[PDB]
């Protein structure tokens, strides 16, 4: 057919794109559906039973966070495609579970398996995408496309779930979604064909050494703070809007829509703009624009007042992510051994920590401290961390550091 084998290496791009699409679709659709099921079942330790609502998000977030490094080691331990297929199967089993699912304790187990699959895919597919694309500009382009797929998934999720749920009922958004997962697996089984183990030719650097590299840490912190911006912004915007704006129910999706559209636009154009213009300066501008936008958000007074800053923050987080994703591969190729699993695991740890500590901590900080103060402190953190991206202009090579050490002693 169109792909008898990996005749086009863009087939791997398509695989990763649709995998991330389906993963964030599972992540987003269940969010408004959990409270309805929980309330209906409860109608038909109470403080614990209330904070367990946020424990829903915390479950997937923490499972992903814990699971990333083990998958990163596993990829170069035995090979790339097998973790992708295993994470596929785990995600499919979880997806089949959510629906038949009823009991709360089983639902948490289901979404924990979802997190296992999400982490495994986001590590293995990303690493294999980096490995097949050794060219810097092409790697940046394909990584921007994959992040654009992530953003488009998180944009399409909520209405896709809501329309089917309101049309048929409970299992409708889940069964067809699992069928799309099965179609992905039918593609994968012939595209990858991992019917034999492929041990890695070159041994990987220890993970502890990577955490000692300052530039990897700078890029990881940039990604972490930029994602924590929108992650913290997600819960607290509707409640503050209801408190001060005297608003209604339906403005919420329209108000957050600019952020997702701008994310989708940013991650697909800045993949090709960054290499032409410069990754470090792109990251610096992204951080600065994130800070300005988040600073401007509390000062607004009408919905039209919030239209512009959400567009700005989406655009800027898109720049930061699409410019700092391939710099991990660039650095590990420049001054380390060419194995990308561990470094991309670190990058995804930074990515997921924001979603992990966003909702609950932001709610608590809003409870004890003014929400405008939350936005201002986030903006201050972003602005003060922005100049640290300057160090990524021309990193020294491993030979240079060896010579520096030999001059020291």
């Amino acid at each position, epitope marked *: 057919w169109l792909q008898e084998s990996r005749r086009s290496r863009k087939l791997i791009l398509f695989i990763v794109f649709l995998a991330l699409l389906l993963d964030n679709m599972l992540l987003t659709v269940v969010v408004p559906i959990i409270p309805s099921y929980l309330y209906s079942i409860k109608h038909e330790d109470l403080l614990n039973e209330n904070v367990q609502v946020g424990l829903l998000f915390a479950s997937k977030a923490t499972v992903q966070l814990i699971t990333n490094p083990f998958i990163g080691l596993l990829t170069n331990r035995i090979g790339y495609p097998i973790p992708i297929f295993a994470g596929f199967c785990i995600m499919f089993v979880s997806t089949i579970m959510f629906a038949f699912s009823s009991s709360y304790a089983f639902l948490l187990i289901a979404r924990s398996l979802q997190g296992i699959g999400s982490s495994c895919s986001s590590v293995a597919g990303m690493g294999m995408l980096a490995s097949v694309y050794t060219d810097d500009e092409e790697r940046g382009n394909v990584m921007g496309i994959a992040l654009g797929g992530l953003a488009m998934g998180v944009l399409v999720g909520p209405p896709f779930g809501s329309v089917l749920y309101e049309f048929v009922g409970k299992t409708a958004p889940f069964l067809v979604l699992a069928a799309l997962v099965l179609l992905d697996g039918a593609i994968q089984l012939f595209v990858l064909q991992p019917s034999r183990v492929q041990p890695e030719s070159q041994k990987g650097t220890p993970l502890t050494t990577l955490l000692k590299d300052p530039y990897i840490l700078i890029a990881a912190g940039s990604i972490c703070f930029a994602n924590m911006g929108i992650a913290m912004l997600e819960p607290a915007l509707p409640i503050w809007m209801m408190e001060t704006m005297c608003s209604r129910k339906w403005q919420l999706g329209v108000a957050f829509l600019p952020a997702s559209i701008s994310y989708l636009i940013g991650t697909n154009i800045f993949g090709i703009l960054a290499h032409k213009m410069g990754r470090w300066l792109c990251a610096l501008l992204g951080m600065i624009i994130v800070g300005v936008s988040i600073l401007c958000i509390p000062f607004a007074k009408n919905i039209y007042g919030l239209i512009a800053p959400n567009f700005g923050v989406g655009f800027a987080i898109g720049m930061v992510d699409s410019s700092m994703m391939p710099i991990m591969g660039y650095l590990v190729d420049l001054r380390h051994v060419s194995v990308y699993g561990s470094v991309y695991a670190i990058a995804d740890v930074a990515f997921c920590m924001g979603y992990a500590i966003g909702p609950s901590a932001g709610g608590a900080i809003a409870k004890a401290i003014g929400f405008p103060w939350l936005m201002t402190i986030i903006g201050i953190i972003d602005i003060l961390f922005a100049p640290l991206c300057f160090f990524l202009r021309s990193p020294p090579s491993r*030979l*240079e550091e060896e*010579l520096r050490r030999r001059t020291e002693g």
Partner: nanobody
Amino acid sequence: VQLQESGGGLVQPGGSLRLSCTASGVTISALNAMAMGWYRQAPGERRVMVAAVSERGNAMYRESVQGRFTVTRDFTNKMVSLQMDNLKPEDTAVYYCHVLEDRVDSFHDYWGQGTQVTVSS
């Protein structure tokens, strides 16, 4: 991989001298992959690094030699060379040539014949 060099001599303090090390036994591409410089050893003293260059073209001079030495590596002529503009009596040492190749973890080092320079006091 074999290398050659020339230089050395006796001169009063304040003079000038030029040292050049040649690498004609290895190809240009492998020469670019490697890193090279000039070694230094004194009677009854250990090696302490003075000036080396790499494919970044960055030379980390030792703290006391900044400005005193001048080193340049040729990517085409296969020569690493040193130029120096000032002398002091504390320069009693013997200078060697060397290379590093860090694609292997052992970074196989190959030394040159070496040159000795002493300064009258």
